[PDB]
Design a protein around this ligand. Structure first.
Ligand SMILES: OC[C@H]1O[C@@H](O[C@@H]2[C@@H](O)[C@H](O[C@H]3[C@H](O)[C@@H](O)[C@H](O)O[C@@H]3CO)O[C@H](CO)[C@H]2O)[C@H](O)[C@@H](O)[C@@H]1O
Ligand SMILES: OC[C@H]1O[C@@H](O[C@@H]2[C@@H](O)[C@H](O[C@H]3[C@H](O)[C@@H](O)[C@H](O)O[C@@H]3CO)O[C@H](CO)[C@H]2O)[C@H](O)[C@@H](O)[C@@H]1O
Ligand SMILES: OC[C@H]1O[C@@H](O[C@@H]2[C@@H](O)[C@H](O[C@H]3[C@H](O)[C@@H](O)[C@H](O)O[C@@H]3CO)O[C@H](CO)[C@H]2O)[C@H](O)[C@@H](O)[C@@H]1O
Ligand SMILES: [Cl-]
Ligand SMILES: [Cl-]
Ligand SMILES: [Cl-]
Ligand SMILES: [Mg+2]
Ligand SMILES: [Mg+2]
Ligand SMILES: [Mg+2]
Lengths: 334, 335, 335
């Protein structure tokens, strides 16, 4: 009976091992000792996808923390999967991820993984289909359930804003800014210790509107998705890419913390190769060098053998080209 | 086939016995003889809840009218129930309530029983979940079906506006005012004889925004839900509560008709006790005295043995503490 | 698995026979040689309705093009049918219509066939029920699939705006204008060769708001639904109807292209007769004379034996009164 449906419960924070909160101070993330923190890690696939092949397990997290040097895992929660499993079930699985991550001393970025234009509720693909109401409700539920949980560090409000050349709507920064501020207000009303992560247009590549009209809230970080072909210099070299990246997203790191929550590549003739993830490999050192210089955090896309570009070729964790590259980088940084 | 789906019908007004319309005149409700009218009654549970236990029957209405002195029943129509039964079936059951009430000479308040912030479509619990579209459609259907039915006196547009400390959205009077005016306009387009009832924030407790920006429509009344702990004076007495109630909602009765569509209490250690319905009992005489002085109408929450705070302890209508208290008050007022 | 659902594909334009695009220039439609073009044709029923009785077939289009003189068919896509068949299946059937029409050298008007007020998402009947999100998605999908297809000439954004005497919402031209501009922008982003068709209030009858506040986009045309009883002169004659039609919709043809996407009549005591389609027959020559004089395009409602007013009495295409009349008119004009 509907009148017997219980009110929701909050995650039991006393079940967790000690773990520092991460907070925003100026243009940096810091831990509870004031030491500069950098999120360095990977995306995994949607929980529902992993469950379907029996790969949603602690052993996945252990492999990453122990053998790949990650301090962060990004969970891309697809709206279609949220609906298919249903909120109560999906949240129960996120609880498992919180416990596994906490046990390993690593952090989670929760990503509402849609692609398109939320103000008009039009999207790149139905797997990303959502509504303002559903998006608000997702964040209402998440914020309430994970109040005062250090393991869950970042709430990435909407993965990839895009109008696909204004076919989905008319991109308008003021309208998108206002909507992010509305989401932030709902979150901050319920938990002020979380870090909202806000994205610009062109699939979370273009942060340039924040130069004139930044989000008017404190404690936030900005996303960037600097895939190799987002910048298109006529001549491909460090100088030309750095200038282009500087103007579109890199500048943000001077004033706000930035997380490159998606990056990576595959050979142009490789598995699942498509624009804008095609590259000969020179991008890897280039993007790492740039991020290092700017102090930018990152989560590689994606630690999965099916979704591309892959970091692994199988569920024995055989590394792909980009996987082998980032594995060495992250292990050195740890 | 979808192209064969028939257009809706209206309630047959000729099936009803003679009953006066209630109308708004200034700060008062009046009957068709211009005599001041006060709604005095109770809430019952959602129709779907009552149906599930075979308690949706005329005998319920008869008990209330004959033995509890009510002239009004408030039906709190939960959106989840509206969806579960479906509009056509739910409306058929509301038709039954109209006939029963009309036969007894009593009135109905139809309440779109949601709790939360409609402009962002975020709510306290999924049982209240709705949308602006669904809310409009509810009032479109209701207004059409019950055109020119005196028995259905009041359309209470949205039970309890709240943002739950701005966790549901940013409370904003201007946007809420505009949305109520939109709903009123749809209703008045279809039936001008109905009384819309409009609520403020803090779970329909705070009417103070209407001092500066009242709804810009005539013929309306304002709701109040003055539960015992909504006002929180340091020292609990008549003087201190009256002052607080005056500033938040009582003042409205000087200019507009007011209906306290929810009120009541249970002991702090009693069944279903929670903030803000906890009280030692002194509230009962206090709220009745205040409403009497201001000429405020009321429907007690709730005449049900499960939902709290209860007016009855069972379906034999054994009165609870607050039930026994309000029963005597209403029976006296009916005289 | 949801992650394996493929991305959509576009119609194969190389499968089509040569056919001129139609474009807007000033107050006229023109072909690719700059010659003035007039859409002259009929509505058929919703694809889903036709499928249910096995009447969705090329032979329908052939009958119309060969024997009724049409150069245009309007497809009224009902939202309930779009949902029932589902977008992928419905689009597959529209692909059939594109091929059939193209093979015959005729054109299609795609009509999102709702009746009501999209800004509040309230409608005359559930078969028309939709949302802004669904309406946008329909046009997103259509525009992408039929990019660079000359056969599909017109995208009629929303069949019949009405608030039904403000029972559905408060009619507001600025709000409706803005929403049409938003739809136009999504379409033009994906295909600039299409012609959007925009409607006014009173069931797409009243274009008068465009005198002061026209849609601020180029390449658009305006719809009119001049059913016989939309204008109500005291004395029914050419002079009095022409004056009324001039003021409400005819004036638009002086500045913009106009398509009367619905028109027609049945005797007042005839099959499916209702306001505002009732007429003695004198309307037929009258509306044709008016349109001819103004250079207005048209699609008669409706070439179906069930939906009214009918152009045919059966699926052997036995003409009704209005069908016989318009058949002769269209056949002559095709010369
Ligand atoms: O799902 C099986 C199917 O998956 C394809 O992988 C897709 C990924 O490539 C895709 O990654 C994209 C991100 O989701 C976006 O945020 C970003 O803009 O673009 C990324 C790619 O550049 O994610 C989806 C799920 O969201 C995956 O379906 C494989 O490429 C394909 O081989 C396989 O059949
Ligand atoms: O439903 C089963 C569950 O019911 C609980 O009763 C609830 C009522 O206490 C509740 O009353 C509230 C109103 O609905 C609100 O408008 C108002 O803000 O506060 C009232 C007092 O809380 O209504 C809900 C349904 O809307 C009832 O479910 C019982 O407390 C519980 O024991 C029982 O199992
Ligand atoms: O479908 C079965 C039922 O259909 C009725 O036909 C209806 C048509 O008359 C109706 O046409 C209207 C248009 O849809 C509107 O755009 C316009 O304002 O008015 C037209 C005529 O009044 O369309 C609906 C479907 O949209 C049809 O149902 C038959 O008249 C009836 O006998 C039959 O049982
Ligand atoms: Cl964009
Ligand atoms: Cl509130
Ligand atoms: Cl209208
Ligand atoms: Mg946290
Ligand atoms: Mg009434
Ligand atoms: Mg075209």
């Amino acid at each position: 009976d509907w009148w017997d449906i219980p009110y929701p419960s909050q995650f039991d924070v006393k079940s967790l091992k000690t773990q520092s909160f991460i907070s925003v101070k100026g243009n940096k993330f810091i831990d509870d000792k004031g030491k500069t923190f950098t999120f360095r890690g990977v995306n995994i696939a949607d929980t529902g996808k992993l469950l379907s092949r029996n790969q949603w397990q602690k052993s996945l997290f252990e492999e990453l923390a122990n053998n790949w040097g990650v301090n962060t895992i990004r969970l891309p929660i697809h709206p279609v999967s949220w609906r298919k499993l249903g909120p109560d079930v999906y949240l129960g699985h996120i609880d498992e991820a919180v416990r596994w991550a906490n046990d390993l001393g690593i952090y989670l970025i929760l990503d509402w993984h849609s692609i398109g234009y939320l103000p008009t509720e039009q999207y790149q693909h139905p797997m990303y289909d959502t509504t303002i109401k559903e998006t608000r409700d997702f964040w209402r539920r998440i914020t309430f359930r994970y109040q005062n949980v250090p393991t869950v560090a970042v709430y990435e409000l909407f993965n990839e804003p895009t109008t696909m050349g204004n076919t989905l709507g008319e991109r308008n920064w003021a309208e998108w800014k206002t909507l992010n501020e509305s989401l932030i207000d709902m979150i901050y009303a319920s938990d002020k210790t979380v870090i909202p992560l806000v994205a610009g247009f062109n699939w979370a590549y273009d942060l340039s509107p924040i130069k004139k009209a930044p989000i008017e809230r404190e404690g936030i970080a900005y996303a960037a998705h600097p895939y190799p072909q987002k910048a298109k210099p006529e001549v491909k070299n460090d100088k030309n890419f750095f200038k282009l990246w500087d103007e579109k997203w890199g500048f943000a790191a001077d004033t706000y913390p930035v997380i490159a929550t998606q990056l990576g590549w595959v050979q142009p003739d490789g598995y699942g190769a498509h624009i804008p993830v095609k590259d000969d490999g020179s991008y890897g050192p280039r993007i790492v060098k740039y991020m290092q210089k700017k102090g930018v955090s990152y989560t590689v896309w994606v630690f999965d053998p099916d979704w591309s570009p892959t970091m692994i070729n199988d569920w024995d964790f055989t590394p792909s080209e980009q996987g082998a590259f980032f594995k060495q980088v992250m292990l050195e940084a740890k």
